[PDB]
Structures are given as structure tokens and as C-alpha cells.
A = this chain, B = another copy of it.
Amino acid sequence: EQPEPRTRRRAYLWCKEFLPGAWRGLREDEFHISVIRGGLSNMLFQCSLPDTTATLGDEPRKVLLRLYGEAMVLESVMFAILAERSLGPKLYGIFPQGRLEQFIPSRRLDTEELSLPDISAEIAEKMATFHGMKMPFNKEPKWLFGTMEKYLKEVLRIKFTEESRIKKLHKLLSYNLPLELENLRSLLESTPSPVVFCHNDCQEGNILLLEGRENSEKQKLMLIDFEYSSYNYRGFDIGNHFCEWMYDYSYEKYPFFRANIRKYPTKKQQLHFISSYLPAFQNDFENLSTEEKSIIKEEMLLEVNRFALASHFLWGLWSIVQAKISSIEFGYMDYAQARFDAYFHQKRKLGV
């Protein structure tokens, strides 16, 4: 797929002006560009040198161009920090209309792969590593309930025009969400979880399987797409990831997802995950007694399964608001209903 000749021009100039080596002397007629994702918000292109052109130093042959649609400053700083620490794609250029990033040959994981033991173990290690790092952002964990409050308030003010959405919203408001948010607050306020640097969206579509490295046991993945990252309760990040075993966003018919409550990880599979996470997050952990390890692990199961409720609640509210304001083709209200179904199922499973 080719873009319009006007974006093609703009892109040529960005690469020419921002990238060093052979790129600096490159002519419009030798510029290769093609699409990866299009639309109206976060559009991706692969830009490259022609195969016949030689590099002059260590510049990339090929790069990723990301066109964009307080928060703008924070996301850029963080993208740069991760790039410097080699935990994210390198940052090659930053401008108002977009940015230029390392191109990493890879594919996203499919939902079904999240439960493969070796995949699950590595995701845990990465998340653990990510949780341990220092970032220059606010460390009060106010984003979880602050955000749930903000969306709840919008949700109560929403008037849809189409009858089917009006009906679906009416079924959702029937649960008395402001009362349910307070119950979830008191449950989570009594559930200790250390505040750490969370990804907050650790789903299959934000996990890259790296080309070439498929045979590596423990080093085949990269976490990406940190736009929702913040300091937050650890339980949310793990609980949210566990929830993601149940949703597959690649389904081609409406509503463009498939949900399965029986795909939530078993106790066994949860233990496999936290057995990799704990040593990578608390370095002394491997040298505790058998019995002390079991205690930590059992309290962690309770922790993450409780915070899983906040994953369902938050993304459910989010999705209702998106049904009003997003143009993207997705059955947002059906998804909201699926998250609230799972919420009430998980409440029953926990006895809370």
C-alpha cells in the first residue's frame, strides 16, 4: 500500500532531515515508503533506503514513521528514557506531526499464545523488570481511581442517539455503578499492593515476538506501547494481563472481539506466571524458605485477582465513553457488557 503523494513528500523530508548517514543526501525519487497501519489516529509507515544504496556508518537502513492523530510532554520523555535504557525501540526523530523509531522485525502475539509456559514466564520477567525502574513521574497511585471516577462521571452524562445503544447503556447503568465503584474501592484499599511503574495495558497486541529469536527460551519478546504507563498498583498490571487471556481483538466480524470466561488462567497457570515474576522483581526472593515463598505467592494470587476487578471496571467504563467519541469500527458497548459480565463473575469466584 502507498500513501497520497503529499504525505509521501512530507515523509521524505522528515527522514532526510532527521536521519544521519546516507539519508542526508537522499533524493525524493530513491525514497521507499509503504503502509503498515492507516486510519485517523496513530498511522504507521515503513520508510527505507533502496537496496542498492550503502550506509556510511551505523545509521538504520529502515525505520518506522508514526504519525500522530501535558500528556504530550510526558509520553515523549518516557519514550526517550526507554529508548536510552534499551527497553524500547530507539528514538530517531521527534516532530509535532509524529516520530521516527527503530523498526523491529516481529509480529504481535496472538491471544492463545499468552498461556504457553515459556511465553507467560517471559512476560512476567519483562513486567517485573519494567516495574522495578525509576521514572521522573508522579509516584502517588492516584491514576486508577481518579480515572475510574472521571469516566464514571462522563458515563452518567451520555446520551446516545441510536435506540440499541440507549438500551445497552440503560442495562449497564442498572447495576448502580457509583455504588459498585465504592465497593471496589473498599475492597482494594484493604488489599496491599506496592506502587510501581506499570505498563497498564499489557495485552498481546503490545507484545512483540522478535524475528529470528523464536528458538530462544527466555529472550524472544519485547513489551511496547507505553502510552497508558504510570505509577500504579502492581496488582492492576498483573490482574489486567490475566484478564487479557479472555479477549481476542483479531476477530473479523462484528463486534470485532471474542470473549471467553473459561480462558482466564488456572491457579496453576497464575502460579507459573508469578513464580517468574517474583525472583525478577525482588532479587532476594529465590533464597527464602519453601514455606515463606508459598505465603508470598498465595497473598499475591489474592492481590492480583482482586485488582483484576479494577481491570474489568475501568476498561468497561472506558469502552462506554469510547462508544460515544471513537470513530474506530468496534462493538464498544458489547465489549463494555462483556467486561461487566466478567466483573460480576470474578466477584462470585472470589466471594467478595
Contacts and interface: CB of A to CB of B under 8 A. Distances in A.
A17 B77 contact: no
A7 to B, nearest CB: 19
A350 interface: no
A138 B92 CA distance: 10
Interface stretch (A78-86, A104-112, A113-121, A263-271): A78-86
A100 B80 CA distance: 18
B70 A136 contact: no
Interface residues of A, number: 29
A261 to B, nearest CB: 39
A139 B20 contact: yes
A312 to B, nearest CB: 28
Interface in A65-112: 70, 72-74, 76-77, 80-81, 84-85, 91-96, 99-100
A127 to B, nearest CB: 20
A324 B80 CA distance: 37
Contacts of A92: 136
A80 to B, nearest CB: 5
Nearest to A81: B80
Interface of A: 17-20, 24, 70, 72-74, 76-77, 80-81, 84-85, 91-96, 99-100, 134, 136-140
